[PDB]
């Protein structure tokens, strides 16, 4: 896991975020109103990074891009799109060296599991297991380059929310908007699976988020990351099968900068139009 410090090159790209990232503030029902409130959000048009690290079998000559450091910054955005369900969990914390509890997520397989263990680093004890059609349960082998820790607390298991929907050779179908928020009451999570036909262009349609889970924790988070580097080993070096080869990840991200929004619930109970206040003088007037 972590990385093989293969920091070949870092091209920073900036993209204009269109109308995106509107979520339900509180679990109260309303309909056909124009209630306005202030809360943690991200601006309607804010430049965000486009971390072009999707090296599905390399970009050009196994041109793989790493993602070692990513600071939390009081709240985080996330998005990605890919046919292969290579996306696997997120990591949060400040030091990530058995000094602060780190949020580790394992998806797919049997069921999604979330842990806040105080482990030293990514253990990867069984992250490569019974994959493809090896169809033999040796269980003797283990992931090589790094060891495993033991300290753990607050194990949580549920149905895998990292849903691949229908993984098929379609035009473009998968867009996950896993939004993570940190407050004292509980670490809050939102998601929205949307099919969009553009891969480079972030969709301009107006979708909304829905709450997922209410896990109570009050630990400090300063940096985030995601490790798709499980099964990165070639299995047998002659075999040369790391899934397909190595991995790939989009992890299109951004930061919040809270503000005051005006949300208009529709007749049925969903969000049809939201408007900012400080975006422009016209926004202030609205």
């Amino acid at each position: 896991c972590v990385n093989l410090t293969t920091r070949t090159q870092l091209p920073p790209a900036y993209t204009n975020s269109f109308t995106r990232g509107v979520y339900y503030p509180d679990k109260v029902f309303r309909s056909s109103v124009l209630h306005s409130t202030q809360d943690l959000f991200l601006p309607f048009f804010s430049n965000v990074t486009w971390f072009h690290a999707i090296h599905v079998s390399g970009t050009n000559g196994t041109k793989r891009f790493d993602n070692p450091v990513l600071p939390f910054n009081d709240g985080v955005y996330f998005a990605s799109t890919e046919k292969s369900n290579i996306i696997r969990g997120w990591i949060f914390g400040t030091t990530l060296d058995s000094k602060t509890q780190s949020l580790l997520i394992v998806n797919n397989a049997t069921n999604v599991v979330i842990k806040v263990c105080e482990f030293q680093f990514c253990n990867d004890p069984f992250l490569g297991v019974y994959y493809h059609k090896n169809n033999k349960s040796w269980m003797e082998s283990e992931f090589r380059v790094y060891s495993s820790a033991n300290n753990c607390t607050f194990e949580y298991v549920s149905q895998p929310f990292l849903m691949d929907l229908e993984g098929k050779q379609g035009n473009f179908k998968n867009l996950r908007e896993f939004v993570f928020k940190n407050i004292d009451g509980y670490f809050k999570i939102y998601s929205k699976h949307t099919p969009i036909n553009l891969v480079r262009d972030l969709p301009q349609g107006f979708s909304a988020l829905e709450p997922l889970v209410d896990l109570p924790i009050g630990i400090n988070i300063t940096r985030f990351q995601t490790l798709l580097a499980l099964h990165r080993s070639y299995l047998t070096p002659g075999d040369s099968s790391s899934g397909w080869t190595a991995g790939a990840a989009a992890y299109y991200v951004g930061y919040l900068q809270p503000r005051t929004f005006l949300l208009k619930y529709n007749e049925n109970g969903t969000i049809t139009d939201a408007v900012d206040c400080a975006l422009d003088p016209l926004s202030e007037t609205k």
Partner: antibody
Amino acid sequence: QVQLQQSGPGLVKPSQTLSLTCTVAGGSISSGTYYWSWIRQPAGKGLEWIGRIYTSGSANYNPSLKSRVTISVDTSKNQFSLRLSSVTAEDTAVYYCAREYSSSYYYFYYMDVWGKGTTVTVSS
Amino acid sequence: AIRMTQSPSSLSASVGDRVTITCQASQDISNYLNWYQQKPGKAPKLLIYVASNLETGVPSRFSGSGFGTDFTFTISSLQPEDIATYYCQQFDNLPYTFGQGTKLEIK
């Protein structure tokens, strides 16, 4: 030892509907693990995949032929069928039926068992 | 559609030599490459579903390597029974498209 055996007419007049059927043995087609496909190969030419159908009923075809081809499944009798309309001189080929198997954790896709094929000729 | 181009369309070789055939896809297909065998007068038979492993009943002499868009299939020691046509096939695009084929002959 699942084997697939084909029943066809062998000959179809021009501008008539070709009907083929592939009988699956060694197991029921109602298993959700397989995709059942028709493929064809013209005499002396390469292989061209025609289409698949998932066991649930969902079907997919090569776009160049989507309008004229129809693949159906009958799990209650463990066969699946092909109907190709507006047969032309290029429709003469050997037609194979085959099972595809795939996993979700790793979306690799491959044809692990094939049928024997059936020669379709389009002549008056 | 995705176009697949193999370096040899036909070849003649002798018993015991190592033969290598390449396949190149029009754009990056990761490792979504399958290998088929067409015996004279026989039905198509899957040989290499994934380069890493060999399908049941496939002779051990068949192996695969390569990356990105270019992939290699090797037979470490050709035998007379290996006379056949080998096709590579991507499944990155929606159609399960196949290559043009490489006829491997035995001297």
